[PDB]
Amino acid sequence: RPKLSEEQQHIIAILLDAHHKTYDPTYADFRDFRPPVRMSPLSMLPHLADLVSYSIQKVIGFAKMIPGFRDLTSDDQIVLLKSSAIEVIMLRSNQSFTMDDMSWDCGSQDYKYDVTDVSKAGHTLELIEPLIKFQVGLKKLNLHEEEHVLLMAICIVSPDRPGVQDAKLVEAIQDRLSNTLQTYIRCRHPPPGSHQLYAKMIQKLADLRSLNEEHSKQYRSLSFQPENSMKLTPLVLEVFGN
Amino acid sequence: KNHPMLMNLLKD
Ligand SMILES: CCC(CC)(c1ccc(OC[C@@H](O)CO)cc1)c1ccc(OC[C@H](O)C(C)(C)C)cc1
Numbered sequence: 528r529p530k531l532s533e534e535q536q537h538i539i540a541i542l543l544d545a546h547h548k549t550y551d552p553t554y555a556d557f558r559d560f561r562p563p564v565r566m567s568p569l570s571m572l573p574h575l576a577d578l579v580s581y582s583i584q585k586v587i588g589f590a591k592m593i594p595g596f597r598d599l600t601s602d603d604q605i606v607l608l609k610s611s612a613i614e615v616i617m618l619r620s621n622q623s624f625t626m627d628d629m630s631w632d633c634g635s636q637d638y639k640y641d642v643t644d645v646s647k648a649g650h651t652l653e654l655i656e657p658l659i660k661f662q663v664g665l666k667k668l669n670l671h672e673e674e675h676v677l678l679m680a681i682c683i684v685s686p687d688r689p690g691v692q693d694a695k696l697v698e699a700i701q702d703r704l705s706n707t708l709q710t711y712i713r714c715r716h717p718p719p720g721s722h723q724l725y726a727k728m729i730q731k732l733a734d735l736r737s738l739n740e741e742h743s744k745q746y747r748s749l750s751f752q753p754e755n756s757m758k759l760t761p762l763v764l765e766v767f768g769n
Numbered sequence: 770k771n772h773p774m775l776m777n778l779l780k781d
Pocket residue numbers: 550551572575576578579582616617619620623631640644645648650746749763
């Protein structure tokens with residue numbers, strides 16, 4: 528009979544507040560991004576570049592708060608963030624994604640984003656199709672907020688990211704997180720929702736590796752032309768590559 | 770050297 532210990536309730540309380548401090552459900556800062564343009568050879572590039580950039584900053588802010596992440600070397604902190612960022616952004620975007628019309632609704636019509644907007648940032652269906660698919664199936668899981676923050680933290684603290692030096696340290700942090708999530712589903716997620724829930728969550732992480740790869744490929748294609756690359760941000764260029 | 774901005778956002 529496994530129970531949620533003091534330490535695990537602590538972990539969940541930390542990740543919740545970490546999330547609360549880094550996700551603004553009023554989407555108030557959006558007014559500062561270069562404006563959206565819907566008429567267009569890549570008319571959404573500057574607005575979504577800015578949105579991703581912002582998102583990167585908030586993902587870093589959440590990552591810093593993960594129990595044990597601070598114990599990592601600054602070089603592994605960097606490796607974990609560079610390789611996970613797009614993945615965590617896809618997961619956190621789920622919170623604003625609506626099955627109503629397969630779009631991301633950030634408060635208002637100007638900041639409601641759909642398939643044609645991502646198209647206009649220079650992405651093709653090779654990515655968008657399995658991206659909506661992902662959002663749809665992650666939405667259907669109906670995670671408790673607790674499961675959502677833990678899935679994001681588990682994604683960031685992955686031992687097999689290329690370039691990891693203290694793999695064994697990354698593993699003990701992540702295992703302490705898996706264990707908290709597994710035990711959590713058991714104690715707090717009632718059936719039929721709880722059924723295979725963990726395995727389905729872990730499967731969304733595998734789906735993320737594939738989306739990551741395809742995002743990277745099209746980002747490398749986008750940033751071929753120094754003219755597109757001009758319209759990104761310094762943080763995007765540093766984190767996604769140059 | 771070569772991730773200044775990311776490094777700075779990570780700092781305590
Ligand atoms: C618009 C949909 C989506 C879905 C993950 C997206 C949706 C919402 C996002 O932020 C919401 C929260 O962070 C705010 O608190 C961030 C991203 C996306 C964006 C940009 C995008 O591509 C942009 C492109 O990669 C480039 C070149 C601009 C970086 C692809 C998908």
